[PDB]
Amino acid sequence: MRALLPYLALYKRHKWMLSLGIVLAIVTLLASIGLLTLSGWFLSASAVAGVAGLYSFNYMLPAAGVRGAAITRTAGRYFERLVSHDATFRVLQHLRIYTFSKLLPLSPAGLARYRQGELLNRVVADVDTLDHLYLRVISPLVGAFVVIMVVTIGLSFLDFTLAFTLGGIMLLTLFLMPPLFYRAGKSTGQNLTHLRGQYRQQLTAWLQGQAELTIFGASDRYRTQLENTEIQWLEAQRRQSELTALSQAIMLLIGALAVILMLWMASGGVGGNAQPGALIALFVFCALAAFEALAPVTGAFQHLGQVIASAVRISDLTDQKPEVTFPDTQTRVADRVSLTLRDVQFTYPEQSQQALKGISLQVNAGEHIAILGRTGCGKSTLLQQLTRAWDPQQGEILLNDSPIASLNEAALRQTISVVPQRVHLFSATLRDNLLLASPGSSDEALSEILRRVGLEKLLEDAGLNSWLGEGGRQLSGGELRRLAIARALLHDAPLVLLDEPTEGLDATTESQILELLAEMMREKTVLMVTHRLRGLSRFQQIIVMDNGQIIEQGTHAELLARQGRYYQFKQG
Amino acid sequence: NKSRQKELTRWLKQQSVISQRWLNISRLLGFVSGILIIAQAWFMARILQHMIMENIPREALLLPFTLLVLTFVLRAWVVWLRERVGYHAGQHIRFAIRRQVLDRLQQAGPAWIQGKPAGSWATLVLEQIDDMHDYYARYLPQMALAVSVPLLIVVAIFPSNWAAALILLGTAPLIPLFMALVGMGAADANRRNFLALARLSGHFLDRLRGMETLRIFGRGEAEIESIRSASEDFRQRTMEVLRLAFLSSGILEFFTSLSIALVAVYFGFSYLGELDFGHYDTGVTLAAGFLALILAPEFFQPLRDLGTFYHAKAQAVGAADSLKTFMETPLAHPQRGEAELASTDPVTIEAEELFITSPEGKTLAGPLNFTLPAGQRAVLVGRSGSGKSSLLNALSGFLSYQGSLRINGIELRDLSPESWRKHLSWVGQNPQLPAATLRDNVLLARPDASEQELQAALDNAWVSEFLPLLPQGVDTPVGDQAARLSVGQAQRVAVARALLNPCSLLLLDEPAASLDAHSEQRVMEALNAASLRQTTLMVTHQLEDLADWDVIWVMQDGRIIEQGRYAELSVAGGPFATLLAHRQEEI
Ligand SMILES: Nc1ncnc2c1ncn2[C@@H]1O[C@H](COP(=O)(O)OP(=O)(O)OP(=O)(O)O)[C@@H](O)[C@H]1O
Ligand SMILES: Nc1ncnc2c1ncn2[C@@H]1O[C@H](COP(=O)(O)OP(=O)(O)O)[C@@H](O)[C@H]1O
Ligand SMILES: O=[P-]([O-])[O-]
Ligand SMILES: [Mg+2]
Ligand SMILES: [Mg+2]
């Protein structure tokens, strides 16, 4: 419950709306209890008066009471559901902004120890589960407490002992039953989320290794232990339905004890008179209708356990420290930058094998370097040292013979222009996908770069306004790569880092991109990381990587002259 | 929209036959639940009348108290019982659908599983089968409690008063009518905001994903205002949708509180001499008003719970949308057989007019003709996409072939897969380690092996030369989430696992494709001394120093065009000259 505190701070903003939504959940819930309590007394008072005393009985007052109490629970529930959800949606915006802002400083580093495909889908669900602490846990538990109170003080005028033993029974269950069920199911909720991720881990490895499991005759041995995990998993699910069934059955044996008690106890006199008459109904029907206040409460033990898990899961992800530390010196961006590296070493967190054994690399200004390697040599790990995703444990990285760690982030992002290996297509419009490169560019300025990189087909049928993202037009793999270059061109920076810019492309579009990179980026330093061998003659130096090492270095012609790994690349 | 949704619901009803015994006890206990609701409402009404009208003391009503407590205890037992049977009904359907999905995925094989990412299948099996629970556990048992219980109240009140039973029954045709008038208005707001709402739902995950791109452009601070201005739009658009969604719900709470208001007023005035109508001539009774008043809120409770459980129908048909198409795809797969190979000697492979067909039905390899006698090792060379790996999947049994492909003279499709695979062993292009530890992967072919022959496997493959690097030695839990092995290190484990058992055919598939210099020469050396012991079919890109392999096959669009010794193909002009002389080596 202490990990639920950082997000209760977010709830302090928009406290008014949240308080008003709770208040309407009390007026509605008191009208519901008051409609049945007054109806039960009105029926009992009319029956005791009988046909005699038609004019003697003041039936108009309850009749307008049962009409007002009925309207304010139909209308109150309407605005309770509006203010509660509207206030929830405002907190959701603060939760989304808080989570995003606490994840940017560690966006490539703090999230690299997880599987990023399923981590961020879990983060979005964790924020949605945190956003519903108010609707599922806070609004019922706090709305039930101040209805049990108003009913207790409300009925204390007629008889103290009845109101104190109805309010006492209702208070006891409110304060004691959610904790005893959150405690009883605490182990299962831990077991449920552990067996769920184990079944996902065993199933994914069963599907991926299906070719290997089938041949080696383990596809059935590894399915039996997969189906035994599901049996364990379904058993944990079954035990949560034994606490949802028990809490639903216990709340019915408590709302039954408070009706048997207000029948037996309120028949021995309500206050002074030994024969209360109509007052018995007002206490039996109150105890009958007052346990709908606790109906939302009987499930709030299951929802509190989930919200707590999300609070812990989000926190320990965003409460860890960024790998890099950006100074505030506020330097000025250079016009031309030279890249220098000396013995850069880097072991990924929680690993025992070095990703970068040692890198020596000099890239003068206006020089086009290419880095060659196979899968997993460590080349895209080198580019993330230059953008300061990580810090090399041993080694020094220089920009214009000044350490790269001495640049404030706003200046580093203006010195480095990078096209990633995995180009990300944002959901927003085509103009917005380019305006992140340079916000100040104009529509014509965006258009010239877009048609210059060969993406002129995106300039038709409201092309610059087409949605072009998820829930919209999806760009092809070849077109997506041209989009990445269009951002690198718009975001003019002295040094341009490329990460497999021609991966998975036919030679027709591979040549078009390669010729586009040599002519547009002629005056800008380029460090292109390549898995292919096409069009490497225009590069002043080719650096061949192998298992985190620079095994070969030199110009294209020089590399062919001396027999080595680069020679083995063309001729196997 | 209405065409598919009708077809999906019949699919859900088809699956409910699994655990139909428990979907009946849920329906039977729902009727008994509505009887105990009436019994306790009658017991309370008769207790309360005696102590309010004729002032009978509580100590003379011990029998109704005793029966009222028992009714309350029985009610709690039924609610406890009904939840457990509802879950039991839900999980048999999930347990059986998950077996049909996993049986379909296992029989389809790696040829079809590779079509989608392992997280796309894991959503089908985990997320979308678990989405169907609350349809069978809550919504279906509630759609039967919503029609049985409210009719029991009307049937139990009609004998005592026909207007009290008409107040409740008068809102039975009013709620669906009014809920549909607001439905016409809702469809106006829902459809206008449908495009944008689905457009803004995936916004936060889209900024969260690809947060690297925002970092490398320095736009992390200007996208806070994008999240702020896409959450203001989402909230405003969805609240105008929700003004009509909570109004449709409010119809039930309007008639819930009007039905308790009219019952209170009609009975209240009936006791005061007014409103003499509505009751049979015998007379008016206080216990006949308590019984109707206690049961009026319980008339709509089954219809109010159903409002909360209705979302379980939408997420069970969306689950059924992607589960029906999964089970309805034709997925033609290789024919299983019963004959088996007794001999463990190297096999002879000959194919006449052999065609490899994709699981969907298209052909991946054309009319292949080749013959590979026992003990002879062949090598497959060709351009990318030439059907090189489709031939290796057919020999593995993963793909269906229409032509002829014989193993020792016995047709492959007439060979029992569970025995053919014991004579089969290969190393793929990518190391797929599906076992927990590094020793469990090596021993995956035969787990009951002693250390002597385990230690021999590691040394023969040079898996033991990087063991000191690993933290726990040979028992390290391996993976991308624990003790990452480089592609060179994981490929040597895949070689060690493949060479653990003697085999008849070794289908090495581009093993040294993406490896560093050291592991490439350690994997290739081990598999050059392993290809000799049995007939071997390799596919490779590095066609230099390929002379010692006996017969070389060259593939073109799915046809073996040229064959023979390396010397004969190398010197002679032909397609092998084109592959070798044009040493482009694009990667
Ligand atoms: N499971 C599948 N379902 C449908 N089509 C497929 C499947 N597997 C391959 N194909 C298609 O059939 C053709 C068969 O080519 P194949 O994958 O055998 O080439 P390859 O020899 O593996 O080339 P490379 O080794 O360079 O990938 C390919 O063009 C591919 O697109
Ligand atoms: N997040 C990570 N945590 C630990 N190890 C990683 C991570 N990402 C990559 N590696 C390892 O580092 C090596 C080099 O990674 P990378 O530079 O991404 O490959 P490439 O150089 O082919 O782009 C790979 O063998 C990989 O196993
Ligand atoms: O591992 P991939 O980035 O070459
Ligand atoms: Mg990379
Ligand atoms: Mg292949």
Side-chain angles (χ1 to χ4, degrees), chain A, chain B residues 1-582:
Chain A
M1 281 275 320
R2 291 294 297 265
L4 204 63
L5 286 196
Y7 323 100
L8 274 177
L10 302 177
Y11 274 93
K12 211 56 59 198
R13 301 86 165 264
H14 328 271
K15 63 188 175 311
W16 158 253
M17 274 284 274
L18 301 175
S19 301
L20 177 65
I22 282 172
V23 164
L24 294 167
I26 308 156
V27 168
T28 314
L29 183 63
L30 279 176
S32 305
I33 298 164
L35 181 53
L36 271 162
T37 313
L38 174 60
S39 313
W41 170 88
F42 188 34
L43 263 66
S44 296
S46 310
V48 168
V51 166
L54 197 161
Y55 319 111
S56 167
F57 193 89
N58 201 347
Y59 66 96
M60 281 322 294
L61 186 49
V66 305
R67 194 251 301 290
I71 289 176
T72 179
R73 70 150 266 172
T74 299
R77 185 64 78 206
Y78 179 66
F79 299 124
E80 184 265 329
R81 297 285 95 206
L82 289 180
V83 181
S84 301
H85 288 239
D86 195 298
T88 287
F89 288 145
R90 302 180 194 270
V91 178
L92 177 55
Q93 163 191 335
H94 288 231
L95 267 167
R96 301 221 266 208
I97 284 165
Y98 168 84
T99 295
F100 197 85
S101 300
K102 294 269 283 193
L103 282 179
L104 270 160
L106 72 164
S107 59
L111 280 76
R113 54 151 271 161
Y114 310 92
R115 186 166 193 171
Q116 270 210 41
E118 81 180 73
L119 168 80
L120 296 173
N121 274 284
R122 158 154 40 111
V123 166
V124 171
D126 282 1
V127 160
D128 291 332
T129 316
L130 281 161
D131 185 36
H132 285 110
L133 159 76
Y134 166 73
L135 267 179
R136 279 140 164 189
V137 187
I138 287 182
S139 185
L141 278 161
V142 178
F145 173 74
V146 296
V147 171
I148 299 163
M149 282 277 98
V150 168
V151 165
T152 307
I153 296 89
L155 298 172
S156 288
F157 297 95
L158 312 179
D159 203 340
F160 265 66
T161 178
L162 298 182
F164 284 171
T165 192
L166 168 63
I169 278 179
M170 291 205 327
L171 267 186
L172 274 185
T173 75
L174 161 70
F175 278 79
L176 187 80
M177 184 177 177
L180 291 179
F181 271 98
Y182 171 83
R183 179 214 54 94
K186 184 177 183 292
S187 85
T188 305
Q190 286 181 163
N191 215 37
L192 202 52
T193 182
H194 158 75
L195 286 165
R196 174 186 176 182
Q198 164 167 326
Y199 187 77
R200 201 190 205 281
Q201 169 194 257
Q202 280 168 351
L203 171 75
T204 295
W206 189 71
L207 296 183
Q208 287 187 160
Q210 190 64 18
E212 281 85 8
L213 283 193
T214 303
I215 294 168
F216 302 108
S219 183
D220 282 324
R221 166 173 90 234
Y222 273 58
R223 185 180 184 191
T224 292
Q225 93 178 11
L226 172 76
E227 298 192 305
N228 288 2
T229 293
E230 190 205 11
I231 279 172
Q232 281 189 80
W233 180 22
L234 293 185
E235 189 87 67
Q237 308 188 5
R238 199 191 43 81
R239 306 199 228 269
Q240 291 208 316
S241 67
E242 311 286 330
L243 296 155
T244 303
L246 198 57
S247 64
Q248 286 173 170
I250 285 178
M251 288 278 321
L252 191 153
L253 292 165
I254 293 164
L257 180 71
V259 172
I260 292 303
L261 273 187
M262 309 275 97
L263 273 167
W264 183 279
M265 293 177 71
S267 176
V270 188
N273 45 358
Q275 303 204 150
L279 288 198
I280 303 171
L282 191 151
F283 271 94
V284 175
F285 281 83
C286 194
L288 191 79
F291 281 90
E292 81 183 51
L294 292 158
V297 167
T298 192
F301 83 91
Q302 178 89 1
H303 297 291
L304 184 53
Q306 297 172 187
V307 173
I308 285 182
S310 308
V312 173
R313 202 179 307 119
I314 281 285
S315 300
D316 66 28
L317 177 75
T318 71
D319 276 354
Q320 64 183 357
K321 304 322 161 313
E323 287 266 325
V324 308
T325 316
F326 279 106
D328 297 341
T329 60
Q330 198 182 358
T331 61
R332 181 167 51 257
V333 54
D335 301 304
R336 285 215 311 159
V337 298
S338 78
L339 183 71
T340 298
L341 272 77
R342 304 169 188 168
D343 203 18
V344 165
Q345 319 197 17
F346 171 72
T347 312
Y348 271 94
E350 310 171 3
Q351 292 290 341
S352 72
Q353 308 167 1
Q354 263 203 331
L356 293 174
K357 323 295 181 176
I359 308 314
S360 299
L361 174 138
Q362 174 73 38
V363 176
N364 304 351
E367 184 169 353
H368 286 51
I369 310 294
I371 295 172
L372 274 295
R374 294 201 150 141
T375 293
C377 65
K379 41 200 203 298
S380 297
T381 298
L382 191 61
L383 299 185
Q384 270 167 347
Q385 314 270 315
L386 307 191
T387 78
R388 294 207 59 193
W390 281 278
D391 280 330
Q393 310 167 353
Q394 293 179 356
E396 194 176 1
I397 306 187
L398 278 297
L399 295 192
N400 287 317
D401 201 24
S402 71
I404 196 172
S406 79
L407 269 60
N408 59 295
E409 176 202 331
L412 179 58
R413 303 317 177 193
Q414 205 67 34
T415 296
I416 306 297
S417 159
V418 62
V419 298
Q421 199 185 313
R422 172 174 71 262
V423 183
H424 192 252
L425 185 69
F426 283 99
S427 64
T429 67
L430 169 57
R431 161 195 290 100
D432 273 357
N433 280 6
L434 308 162
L435 280 188
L436 59 92
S438 72
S441 284
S442 301
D443 289 335
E444 169 55 36
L446 291 191
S447 195
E448 64 174 358
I449 301 299
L450 201 59
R451 77 174 80 253
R452 184 221 300 261
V453 295
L455 270 187
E456 190 276 331
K457 324 322 191 213
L458 297 197
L459 282 174
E460 55 89 20
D461 187 13
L464 205 62
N465 287 329
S466 199
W467 190 240
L468 188 153
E470 189 80 32
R473 158 177 197 175
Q474 283 301 62
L475 279 194
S476 65
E479 280 185 324
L480 206 54
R481 182 64 63 182
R482 309 165 159 276
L483 175 77
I485 305 174
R487 291 169 182 156
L489 299 183
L490 279 154
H491 182 90
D492 271 332
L495 171 82
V496 176
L497 310 178
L498 291 79
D499 209 354
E500 271 96 330
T502 61
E503 181 67 11
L505 295 183
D506 55 70
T508 300
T509 181
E510 175 177 1
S511 181
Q512 271 155 101
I513 278 167
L514 281 168
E515 72 164 40
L516 167 75
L517 297 165
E519 71 155 30
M520 294 299 291
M521 293 179 183
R522 195 210 71 241
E523 75 290 344
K524 293 187 286 185
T525 306
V526 163
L527 181 54
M528 155 169 181
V529 173
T530 303
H531 166 237
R532 289 190 180 198
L533 283 82
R534 178 81 175 83
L536 294 172
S537 64
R538 319 275 306 281
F539 287 100
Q540 273 64 80
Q541 197 181 206
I542 300 179
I543 306 188
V544 165
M545 277 196 72
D546 197 74
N547 207 26
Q549 288 163 352
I550 306 306
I551 58 172
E552 313 195 349
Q553 202 171 353
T555 310
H556 162 232
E558 211 290 326
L559 273 177
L560 281 186
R562 40 144 299 178
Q563 288 308 86
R565 180 72 179 180
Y566 186 51
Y567 172 93
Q568 299 189 56
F569 266 127
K570 304 143 151 163
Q571 299 181 0
Chain B
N1 187 41
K2 59 154 192 205
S3 56
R4 196 67 204 290
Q5 206 277 357
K6 184 179 288 293
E7 196 72 47
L8 285 181
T9 311
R10 311 157 69 141
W11 188 81
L12 302 171
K13 176 72 170 70
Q14 184 178 2
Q15 317 304 319
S16 83
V17 176
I18 314 160
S19 86
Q20 189 71 269
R21 199 182 87 181
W22 296 284
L23 284 167
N24 271 332
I25 310 164
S26 299
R27 203 204 89 233
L28 286 190
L29 288 164
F31 183 87
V32 178
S33 168
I35 285 299
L36 301 149
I37 289 170
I38 296 173
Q40 63 151 76
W42 185 86
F43 282 123
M44 299 206 248
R46 274 259 292 179
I47 293 165
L48 275 159
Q49 178 191 209
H50 298 335
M51 55 183 37
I52 290 183
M53 291 290 332
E54 61 206 80
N55 311 115
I56 280 183
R58 63 191 188 197
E59 302 93 17
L61 306 178
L62 274 184
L63 169 65
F65 291 165
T66 302
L67 291 179
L68 182 56
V69 171
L70 262 66
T71 307
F72 269 126
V73 170
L74 278 172
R75 264 201 71 161
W77 184 40
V78 167
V79 175
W80 173 86
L81 206 45
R82 209 180 169 271
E83 180 97 10
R84 288 161 29 100
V85 170
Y87 171 85
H88 206 81
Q91 86 170 2
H92 281 283
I93 292 145
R94 280 185 309 135
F95 178 87
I97 291 177
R98 196 168 274 126
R99 283 201 59 261
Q100 286 163 27
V101 169
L102 288 190
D103 278 28
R104 185 155 186 80
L105 273 177
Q106 173 155 8
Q107 281 149 25
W112 193 47
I113 293 171
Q114 273 164 10
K116 287 165 43 190
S120 288
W121 296 121
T123 294
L124 183 63
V125 193
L126 273 77
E127 301 305 80
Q128 284 189 355
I129 297 181
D130 285 8
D131 265 348
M132 322 180 58
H133 178 74
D134 265 358
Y135 185 73
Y136 302 104
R138 308 277 218 185
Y139 176 80
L140 281 193
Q142 194 64 232
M143 192 76 218
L145 195 79
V147 298
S148 48
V149 167
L151 285 187
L152 268 293
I153 296 89
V154 170
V155 165
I157 289 181
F158 204 70
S160 288
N161 193 296
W162 66 261
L166 205 78
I167 285 155
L168 311 174
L169 196 47
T171 72
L174 279 169
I175 296 174
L177 161 68
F178 276 113
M179 267 182 155
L181 271 43
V182 300
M184 284 170 200
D188 191 3
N190 180 279
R191 182 176 56 207
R192 184 191 310 81
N193 308 340
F194 179 81
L195 186 74
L197 264 292
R199 184 160 287 181
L200 297 158
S201 86
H203 174 271
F204 180 59
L205 181 52
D206 186 70
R207 295 320 187 259
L208 211 70
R209 213 164 40 194
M211 191 155 38
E212 180 69 22
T213 307
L214 293 183
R215 172 191 83 106
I216 58 177
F217 285 104
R219 299 284 288 165
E221 311 296 330
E223 216 69 25
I224 299 303
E225 278 64 66
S226 176
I227 300 176
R228 168 170 299 121
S229 292
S231 303
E232 287 179 2
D233 197 33
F234 173 90
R235 170 185 58 78
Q236 281 153 20
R237 292 186 107 77
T238 197
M239 282 305 307
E240 297 149 10
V241 170
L242 280 189
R243 274 161 221 281
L244 277 296
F246 300 141
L247 200 78
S248 75
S249 284
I251 295 310
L252 179 83
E253 277 89 4
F254 178 88
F255 293 113
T256 307
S257 59
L258 180 67
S259 299
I260 313 165
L262 287 187
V263 160
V265 163
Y266 154 74
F267 273 104
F269 294 176
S270 198
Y271 298 130
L272 280 178
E274 303 169 354
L275 292 200
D276 182 274
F277 81 105
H279 81 292
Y280 312 88
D281 273 327
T282 298
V284 185
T285 305
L286 173 67
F290 283 162
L291 161 69
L293 186 72
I294 296 179
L295 285 188
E298 303 217 79
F299 184 79
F300 301 88
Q301 199 39 60
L303 294 174
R304 157 167 315 117
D305 290 3
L306 189 54
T308 68
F309 300 146
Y310 206 83
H311 79 280
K313 195 208 188 181
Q315 78 183 8
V317 299
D321 185 11
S322 45
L323 277 158
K324 203 182 137 71
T325 66
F326 175 86
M327 307 282 326
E328 303 299 0
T329 64
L331 258 280
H333 71 288
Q335 188 66 352
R336 316 182 70 86
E338 63 272 17
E340 63 180 41
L341 300 171
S343 164
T344 77
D345 300 318
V347 300
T348 61
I349 297 169
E350 67 274 16
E352 294 187 22
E353 279 275 71
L354 175 54
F355 278 98
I356 285 70
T357 289
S358 170
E360 291 96 50
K362 77 165 295 183
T363 68
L364 313 174
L368 308 164
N369 284 255
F370 59 86
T371 302
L372 199 54
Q376 213 174 30
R377 49 172 180 163
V379 62
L380 270 176
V381 184
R383 293 205 306 101
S384 172
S386 46
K388 295 153 47 186
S389 300
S390 299
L391 189 45
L392 288 199
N393 295 342
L395 272 297
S396 300
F398 302 145
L399 278 181
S400 177
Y401 69 103
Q402 282 84 40
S404 174
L405 174 49
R406 266 149 271 158
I407 308 284
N408 264 353
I410 304 180
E411 275 275 322
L412 188 63
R413 89 184 87 203
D414 288 322
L415 203 61
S416 67
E418 276 78 50
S419 74
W420 167 225
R421 264 73 163 266
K422 294 181 176 67
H423 305 295
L424 199 62
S425 174
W426 55 247
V427 186
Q429 315 191 218
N430 298 114
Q432 270 303 322
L433 307 184
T437 62
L438 190 87
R439 181 182 157 280
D440 279 15
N441 280 299
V442 166
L443 297 173
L444 190 148
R446 169 167 34 94
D448 52 270
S450 69
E451 312 292 332
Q452 181 45 44
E453 69 275 16
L454 166 62
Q455 282 300 157
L458 305 184
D459 303 358
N460 175 38
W462 297 263
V463 167
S464 60
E465 79 179 4
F466 76 91
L467 282 193
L469 294 174
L470 301 177
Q472 307 201 26
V474 67
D475 310 305
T476 73
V478 290
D480 279 13
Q481 269 299 272
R484 266 174 186 256
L485 303 157
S486 83
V487 298
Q489 314 210 329
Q491 179 78 353
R492 294 205 296 263
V493 172
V495 165
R497 159 188 77 202
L499 307 186
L500 183 90
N501 280 335
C503 54
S504 286
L505 176 69
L506 182 72
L507 305 155
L508 309 160
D509 182 19
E510 260 156 308
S514 73
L515 298 185
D516 62 357
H518 177 69
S519 312
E520 165 167 325
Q521 85 179 3
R522 289 296 185 186
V523 163
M524 272 316 269
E525 184 284 349
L527 297 175
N528 262 287
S531 74
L532 308 162
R533 322 194 206 117
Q534 72 270 10
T535 180
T536 309
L537 172 53
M538 183 177 176
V539 57
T540 179
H541 282 166
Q542 313 144 20
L543 72 164
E544 211 77 16
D545 301 2
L546 213 60
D548 215 338
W549 294 72
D550 299 337
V551 62
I552 299 172
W553 304 340
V554 188
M555 284 211 66
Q556 195 97 42
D557 274 320
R559 293 162 320 260
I560 296 187
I561 49 183
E562 184 178 1
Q563 287 184 48
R565 305 288 331 260
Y566 172 73
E568 297 150 35
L569 282 71
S570 53
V571 303
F576 190 59
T578 293
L579 273 296
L580 188 153
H582 169 75

